[PDB]
Design a protein around this ligand. Structure first.
Ligand SMILES: Nc1nc(=O)c2ncn([C@@H]3O[C@@H]4COP(=O)(O)O[C@H]5[C@@H](O)[C@H](n6cnc7c(N)ncnc76)O[C@@H]5COP(=O)(O)O[C@@H]3[C@@H]4O)c2[nH]1
Ligand SMILES: Nc1nc(=O)c2ncn([C@@H]3O[C@@H]4COP(=O)(O)O[C@H]5[C@@H](O)[C@H](n6cnc7c(N)ncnc76)O[C@@H]5COP(=O)(O)O[C@@H]3[C@@H]4O)c2[nH]1
Lengths: 294, 294, 294, 294
């Protein structure tokens, strides 16, 4: 199997390194008269933060009813601990205000790549987490409990392997015809369908397929579909989206899906996530996962 | 029809208000000796930004190969115009460094609601835009060109109305049985299906339905499905997601879908977005949209 | 008809404004001892220009036979009036040479948008002029004299309208099926073909089509084809090409084609350039051009 | 085969030679008091660049809506790093301004041959690259996948040679009758045609031809057509275009076509670029390329 390097979540040791550098710099400040001097700089920052809120009253007043329907807007305007800044302003000029305005005009407070990356993958509001929730709720929550009955119905036409391997290709190749993927992968038949009236559509139909892979074992197998969506979210270039970020979002999607099916409760063992990169081959990986459980 | 208040995109007039306040404050500074003093504050900011990059070398060194595979990491570490800060540091102490570290330790640089809102909806990497791209590529790109032929095939069993009204309920109510939605809405039949081998599944089936609404007109009609996903992304509470943000994300989804089908090229006039809030009724709105085109 | 804003050629009034500002600044220098001082700056420029030529001997010596097959290279190296610089250098140091080299190293002589725009559209070597020459020589020079005979041959199966309206959509929409463009535009038949042995291909075939547009008039009509090429020169993104520059290049193409058919001598009145932007409609514009000549 | 000398792309070693001459001149300046003197010359340049922008406000104000529809114009007016010039102007007269205006009036900033050559072939907006994109998209993208089927259809009336040799004569001779090119080249038959509704023309027809060359081998063969366009872009003299630049543009065209078919993905091996100069002969070169693959 190929080496799976998916990124871990952020541990948050940067604050620890900042604290250590703070303590070391205080020790070198060792080897009372200057503490007031600290305040002469400190509220100098906390003015400008307030200034940012003042400018954020600018556009938000054009969004009163359409986004916020007064006190809600000013509640949303500045960071929530606003009284510390005024508390520090009271404990004491135009140069500071003009410097903060000269910063805020030219826009030199642009965050870097790693900061927006941690802000993206920290919140659960990016593309990959929402799309993984869509794939979990819309498909996997519904089909997977009805898998064993259709398997038994085809059985009247190996109980360890009655699962649903989801191929998750961390990359670009997504194929509709898996018989073009290898000469070893062969189509045999399909499962009995599933009929559900979902979201106004009456009798929506979910299907499957059964693939026999030999040298001599059957399995159910399909691709994780919405990666295909990402495959058109950068090729068509109508979304601001790059290939390196495409690989990043695919790894994030596999990580989020692994997390969701980790704390899943209905999906007992019926799923089996197979993920890979491009280093024939795919049948060899399928056979390795298939023999691994036995 | 109900009043549709969807939020406009950010115009960006806050920078203009900052510039105006800058010019006015410079005029009051009117009515050369102090400009060097500006630099004594100015690089005082640009040190600390560099300090943030120093702390962002901390956790990123635990993410060398798993996210970035040296120079790529330091390239991603600080904001890209790094030389202006060192240029300003050269033009001239421990108090400034300790103040910036004391800020970065306690974490008082937390962005407000409106800043993270503009950062979210500014980039095309939130939940609603990616999910709208999924609904456009997976379903609307495929089905809609094959609509007229199925309509003509049922016609051999009103050409102005041969469309697909997508009900987009900006709210919480999403129903599977539209006959429970009103006594006026009646199910009649379904369109001939669509069979496509998509993403490894052989013979995936797309269906539709035809609803006759009288007092005396037929139409095709369905719900925008993945809003249902959002309806379970906060009720189950396994995602950090609120109801006010649910209404916000639904309005954002309708806006993004309106934008995508605005610049669409295959979907000629075959879609017709109907969106509403909860103020019987739904049939009255459907009849108003249906009579509006004629 | 929509308002056609195509850009005029460059008149060249910027040199006039420079001359006026020169004369005014000389008048303020009024209200002999300093003229030598002028030379102390003046050759200071004309050294560095020579320096640019010295650095342009660098890469060109790697291109001796492959691009230039000595005296040809140095002839091509610097600007052609080289003796004025040495003439000014003789009339009199290391600071000037080091300043010019410090400029040429960091590359601060990067031209702006308007300068490269005037340099592009000034020379007849851009994309749009060459592609318009291709469309004039390859197609319009050959087909158009043989139009009336094919029209008369279909006439034995309104002489004011026997022309070839070339639709030039200044934009993005280019359609292969003009019957999908409007319900009013209808296909009737095609002209008799044209057979020519061109560029090694024996019996290359040129065709046409005849469209009847009613409410009750026929016309010949086709799209300006190579705009489609521009439609794939930025969407596929394999060329450095933007949409705003796509609209600019399309307007430039229509202007160049209008110029070429202006001074044309074989194409008497048989062409009729119809161009438009996107504000049904297209048939209305076609009927307006069709009724305008009568 | 004749020696193919096509020009390589610009490597960019001239900046390296400038940097080396800078370092050597600094070393001779070795073997603090003068650095301010540098600035007394340095902003003396950066004023005049700003002056160029001032004069470029002159004609552009006559092009407000017709090319740019204020802030867009001034954004396009000067080079984008405008603040460095004012930053250097602040760190300190009429002689400098009058010298820069006296330069800009007489127009002694005319670029040389090699500078406009690198600016032309550097950007992808010259004649040859756009015309090569036209020949790739309009013809080679469409015909070449349908080649093998027509070859097999004539085969039912040597699989290594089923290709399309494009003759690219880097020169002036382009002939319509290849049987006049040599007694050895003989016409036999033509391929089955290709019918496509392209750009409003219904049933546009693409053809081919099959040439048997003996002493005893067949091949498909045609000329690169739009070189013929260049053959009329200087002979008719309606475009500013010379014969030496004609050979240069032809070599540039062959290089760009070689690059495009290098990164091509549909055209597997079906093309085979044959290019030559004029030193019978052409059949000998064709036979050498034909025997080379076997
Ligand atoms: N009304 C309706 N009838 C349909 O048959 C249908 N099929 C898809 N869709 C909607 O279009 C989109 C395309 O599916 P996508 O591939 O992007 O992810 C889909 C897909 O990965 C998976 N899935 C759903 N149905 C099938 C199916 N029949 N076969 C395979 N996978 C399916 O579950 C994901 C989410 O489905 P929904 O989020 O409930 O609505 C889908 C989806 O929004 C449908 N909508
Ligand atoms: N409407 C229409 N019907 C035609 O039959 C036709 N034939 C040519 N053209 C247009 O005129 C011009 C002349 O072709 P050129 O030789 O300069 O390069 C042409 C030519 O090199 C090649 N090509 C296209 N069709 C053929 C063809 N039948 N035979 C050989 N070569 C062809 O592809 C190039 C680009 O074609 P288009 O860029 O899509 O439009 C062409 C072109 O703009 C046509 N336009």
């Amino acid at each position: 199997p190929a080496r799976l390097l998916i990124p871990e979540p952020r541990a948050g040791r940067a604050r620890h390194a900042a604290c250590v550098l703070l303590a070391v710099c205080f020790v070198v400040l060792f080897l009372a008269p200057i503490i007031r001097s600290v305040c002469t700089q400190l509220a100098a920052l906390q003015l400008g933060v307030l200034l940012k809120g003042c400018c954020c009253l600018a556009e938000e007043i054009f969004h009163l009813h359409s986004r916020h329907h007064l006190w809600q807007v000013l509640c949303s305007c500045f960071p929530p601990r606003w009284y510390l800044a005024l508390l520090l302003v009271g404990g004491s000029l135009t140069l500071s205000c003009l410097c903060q305005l000269l910063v805020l005009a030219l826009g030199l407070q642009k965050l870097s790549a790693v900061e927006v990356s941690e802000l993206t993958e920290s919140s659960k509001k990016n593309v990959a987490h929402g799309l993984a929730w869509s794939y979990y709720i819309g498909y996997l929550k519904v089909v997977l409990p009805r898998l064993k009955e259709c398997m038994e119905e085809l059985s009247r036409t190996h109980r360890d392997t009655w699962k649903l391997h989801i191929l998750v290709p961390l990359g670009c190749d997504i194929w509709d015809d898996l018989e073009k993927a290898d000469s070893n992968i062969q189509y045999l038949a399909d499962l009995p369908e599933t009929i559900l009236t979902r979201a106004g559509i009456k009798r929506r139909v979910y299907k499957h397929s059964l693939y026999v892979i030999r040298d001599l074992r059957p399995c159910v197998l399909e691709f994780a579909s919405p990666l295909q969506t990402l495959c058109a979210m950068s090729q068509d270039d109508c979304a601001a989206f790059s290939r390196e970020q495409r690989l990043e979002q695919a790894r994030l999607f596999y990580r989020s899906l692994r997390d969701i099916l980790g704390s899943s409760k209905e999906c007992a063992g019926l799923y089996r996530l197979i993920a890979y990169e491009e280093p024939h081959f795919l049948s060899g990986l399928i056979l390795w996962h298939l023999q691994q459980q036995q």
